[PDB]
């Protein structure tokens, strides 16, 4: 999963670079297998009437994680995006790790990270609640309220505009902490019952359906590739509904 030869990495916002490295480091020694995206996608570029969008995809799986997708993107010279989701295998009932960072010439505008529930009661498993609580409440000067579709995110969801380098680093460290908890819980998780697996699958389906309501992503994709491409990308590459 080496990022050493990434074409985008050298030109991305430093917070995005550090987060990409931290995600890759978390995954590096796992029992990884490739996950083939639709059309074996790995790098793509598109332009219509405006700026070009350039995307680099990395995607893996393990027995506990159905799909581990790290996607870096740049629109034109200055708009930088990191997208990451670890989709759980429903059999093990783990939450969804996700993060999104958007940055421009004015710095990072949006930083989101969560471990999101899949249970019918919309709660994280008890072990996650406990480990997350023990991190303490992080201090951020510019909190942002989630849009309605963001009901899918846990009570521990971060959504901020970082105010300075200190906050950028605090946010990255909290994502590192989330990944450490997630990787640990994955090694103590056992296969669940058919009824429980079903429940968790539905939580993941709902997560994907709600993520597809995000017009901030959709507009960026549409401006570079058009409506049909954006719909296929969001529904098949980013947030595939398992069935
Ligand atoms: C893949 C391509 C991709 C694009 C083009 C993208 C764009 C993107 N996402 C954004 C917001 C956002 N992004 C998210 C969250 C997520 N988004 C996610 O993909 C995941 C996994 C999460 C959460 C774990 C949220 C909650 C917002 C704010 C939405 C809003 O303000 O309405 C914004 C607005 C930034 C701002 O208001 O400062 C843009 C331009 N994000 C992307 O990932």
Swiss-Prot record:
The keyword Acyltransferase does not apply. Its EC number is 1.3.7.5. One of its GO terms (biological process) is phytochromobilin biosynthetic process. InterPro entries: Ferredoxin-dep_bilin_Rdtase (IPR009249), Ferredoxin_bilin_OxRdtase (IPR022870). Keywords: Oxidoreductase. It catalyses: (2R,3Z)-phycocyanobilin + 4 oxidized [2Fe-2S]-[ferredoxin] = biliverdin IXalpha + 4 reduced [2Fe-2S]-[ferredoxin] + 4 H(+). GO terms for molecular function: cobalt ion binding; phycocyanobilin:ferredoxin oxidoreductase activity. NCBIfam families: PRK02816.1. HAMAP family: Ferredoxin_bilin_red (MF_00618). The keyword Oxidoreductase applies. This is Phycocyanobilin:ferredoxin oxidoreductase. It comes from Synechocystis sp. (strain ATCC 27184 / PCC 6803 / Kazusa).
């Amino acid at each position: 999963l080496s990022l050493t030869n990434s074409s985008l990495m050298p030109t991305l916002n430093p917070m995005i670079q550090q987060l990409a490295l931290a995600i890759a480091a978390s995954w590096q020694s796992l029992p990884l297998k490739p996950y083939q995206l639709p059309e074996d996608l790995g790098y793509v570029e598109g332009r219509l009437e405006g700026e070009k969008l350039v995307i680099e995809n990395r995607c893996y799986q393990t027995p506990q994680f159905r799909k581990m997708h790290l996607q870096l993107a740049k629109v034109g010279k200055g708009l930088d995006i990191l997208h990451c989701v670890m989709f759980p295998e429903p059999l093990y009932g783990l939450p969804l790790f996700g993060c999104d960072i958007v940055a421009g010439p004015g710095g990072v505008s949006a930083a989101i990270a969560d471990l999101s529930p899949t249970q019918s009661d919309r709660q994280l498993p008890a072990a996650y609640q406990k480990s997350l609580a023990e991190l303490g409440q992080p201090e951020f000067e510019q909190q942002r309220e989630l849009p309605p579709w963001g009901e899918i995110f846990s009570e521990y969801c971060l959504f901020i505009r970082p105010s300075n380098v200190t906050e950028e680093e605090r946010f990255v460290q909290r994502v590192v902490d989330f990944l450490q908890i997630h990787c640990h819980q994955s090694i103590v998780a056992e296969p669940l019952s058919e009824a429980q697996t079903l429940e968790h699958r539905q939580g993941q389906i709902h997560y994907c359906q709600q993520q597809q309501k995000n017009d901030k992503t959709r507009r960026v994709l549409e401006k570079a590739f058009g409506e049909a491409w954006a719909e296929r990308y969001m529904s098949q590459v980013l947030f595939d509904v398992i069935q």
